[PDB]
Amino acid sequence: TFVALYDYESRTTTDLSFKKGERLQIVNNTEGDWWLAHSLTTGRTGYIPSNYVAPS
Amino acid sequence: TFVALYDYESRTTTDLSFKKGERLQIVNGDWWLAHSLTTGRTGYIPSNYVAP
């Protein structure tokens, strides 16, 4: 699992918003700098900036 | 005016969510009542997330 190092507010409908310290499962990381991630807290899924998270 | 140095996601009803680079005017502790010039929303923000 990965952890958010910063808050992130969605800038498009298919982004995932998240808070610093949120645990995230990376669901796809093969399409570029934005990874598809799943929030273990909220259950939501969406794209996130890969540089805002780090392996937990 | 103040600028957001970081994104902030609201954690309470009266918090203000904002994005890095958003311009804010403080209206009035460590949490300040701020008005977003970009979105028009008003709520409390962590004072250490913004800069003049």
């Binding site: 910063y6 808050d7 610093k20 | 970081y6 502790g29 460590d30 949490w31 962590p46 250490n48």
Partner: peptide, 10 residues
């Protein structure tokens, strides 16, 4: 990001 500060005293 910076640790969120304590909420305001009542």
């Amino acid at each position: 990001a910076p640790p969120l500060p304590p909420r305001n005293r009542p």
